Amino acid sequence: KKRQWALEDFEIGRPLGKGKFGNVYLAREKQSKFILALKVLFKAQLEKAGVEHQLRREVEIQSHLRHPNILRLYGYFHDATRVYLILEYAPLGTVYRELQKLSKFDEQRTATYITELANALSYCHSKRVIHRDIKPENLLLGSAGELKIADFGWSVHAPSSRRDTLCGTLDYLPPEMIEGRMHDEKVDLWSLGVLCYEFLVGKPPFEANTYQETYKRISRVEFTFPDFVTEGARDLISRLLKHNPSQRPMLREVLEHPWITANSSK
């Protein structure tokens, strides 16, 4: 923002999450007593794996975004053995944990999350910033329970052709991405459809036992609905999960979808 931070400026608290590259800790800035989240990345581990570039992007992109449904990146610093990301702290945790707790959400909570996410993505896209990694593990919850897009690790500017090695599951990736083709903002609209389905059903629509199998379901767009998913929900999800990118709706149409309108509270 202006000044340069150091570890000594923070009292680290309890672990929020422990991952492959780093951990996320609750932390408080000594002087102002400001409560935030500190993501500690080991570096050597970054240096291996050649991830140094993506991190500059993630930080560069996320630190320049200001939206109520987008977790903020206030700044960063490093030392000899690692890098620190100073993030806004989301008090209610991940959407993933909420989902794992309730099993599945009702139409109202889902419609509200989709809405908040569409606004968030609407803002990102107004900057040709495509997220490409929308999944429940990357969505946090604010003090009022509002959804916050949180992890811009795989974020890039559109249009892009980046053939990045897909390491996690392909569960949220669209056909154009799992096939190494060029892609734009429509990628996020597919993820949104996958997300809407996971929220209501409890499992992503293309889930399978092998990467290779999931790959097939995605490219062929083979998904079915359990009896309890309603017509309006099936409808929105079907418009979003279109193999042809140009056929997926605009976030505006999503926000104005009858089902998103009857059930959304936000």
Ligand SMILES: O=C(O)c1ccc(Nc2ccnc(Nc3ccc(C(=O)O)cc3)n2)cc1
């Ligand atoms: O997947 C993960 O485990 C994960 C992913 C991202 C992450 N990063 C941030 C950043 C800002 N704010 C928060 N809030 C938070 C609060 C409580 C809990 C909890 O479960 O007690 C988890 C998260 N987390 C932390 C953990």
